[PDB]
C-alpha cells in the first residue's frame, strides 16, 4: 500500500540516500496531476451506480450468462456482480488517487483469479465488463483523466487474466 510519494520515498530510502533531483523530479510530476485526480475521483464517486449500470448493460446484460444456466442467472448471483463490479470501480479510484497500483494487487488481485476459478466465475466476461466499465469512465472524467483511471482498469484486467 504505497502511493506515488510512498514509492518515491521507498526507492530513495532503500538505497539510504536523500531525495535527489531525480526523486523529486517524479514527485513534482505527481503534484502537477494532483488537481486532475481529485476531480476524477470526485465525479466517479457521484456516478458510481450509474457507471456500473452502464457497463453491465453494455457488455454482459443480455448475453446468455444472464439467462438460465449462465453464470449470473440467480438474483443472488446477479447481485454479487454489481457488488463485485463496485470494488473494481472503487479500488481503481484509489489507484488513480494514490498514483500507484500497489493497492490493487495487495487488496484485489491476490487470490482473485484463483478464487473465480473456484467459484467457476468466467474470467472472460469479467474483463470485458471491466473494459466496458473503463470505457464509460473515460466518458465522465475526460480524456487524460480517463487515461489515468483507465491505466488501472487494465492493470486489474491484466492480473485477473
Amino acid at each position: 500500500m504505497q502511493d506515488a510519494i510512498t514509492s518515491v520515498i521507498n526507492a530513495a530510502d532503500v538505497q539510504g540516500k536523500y531525495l535527489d533531483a531525480n526523486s523529486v523530479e517524479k514527485l513534482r510530476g505527481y503534484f502537477q496531476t494532483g488537481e486532475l485526480r481529485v476531480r476524477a475521483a470526485a465525479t466517479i464517486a457521484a456516478n458510481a451506480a450509474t457507471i456500473i449500470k452502464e457497463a453491465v448493460a453494455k457488455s454482459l446484460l443480455y448475453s446468455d450468462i444472464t439467462r438460465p444456466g449462465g453464470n449470473m442467472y440467480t438474483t443472488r448471483r446477479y447481485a454479487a456482480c454489481i457488488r463485485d463490479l463496485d470494488y473494481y470501480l472503487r479500488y481503481a479510484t484509489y489507484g488513480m488517487l494514490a498514483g500507484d497500483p500497489s493497492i490493487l494487487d495487495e487488496r484485489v488481485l491476490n487470490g482473485l483469479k484463483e478464487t473465480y476459478n473456484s467459484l467457476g466465475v468466467p474470467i472472460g466476461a469479467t474483463i470485458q465488463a471491466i473494459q466496458a466499465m473503463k470505457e464509460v469512465t473515460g466518458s465522465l472524467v475526460g480524456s487524460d483523466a480517463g487515461k489515468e483511471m483507465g491505466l488501472y482498469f487494465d492493470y486489474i484486467c491484466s492480473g485477473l487474466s
Binding site: 438460465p68 444456466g69 453464470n71 440467480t74 448471483r77 487470490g111 473456484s118 467457476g120
Partner: protein, 46 residues
Amino acid sequence: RTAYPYTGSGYGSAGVPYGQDTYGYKATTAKSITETAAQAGVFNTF
C-alpha cells in the same frame, strides 16, 4: 443443461459443491522458487 456450471449449495445450485471440491480458500500445493526448480531436474546449475 448449461456446461459452465458453478459452485455452492442450497437452492440456486448446479449440483457442484463450492469451489468445485467444497473448499472455498484452497491451501496451495506448490513449493517455493528454488525447489520447484530442484524437482524439475533441469535447473540444476541454476
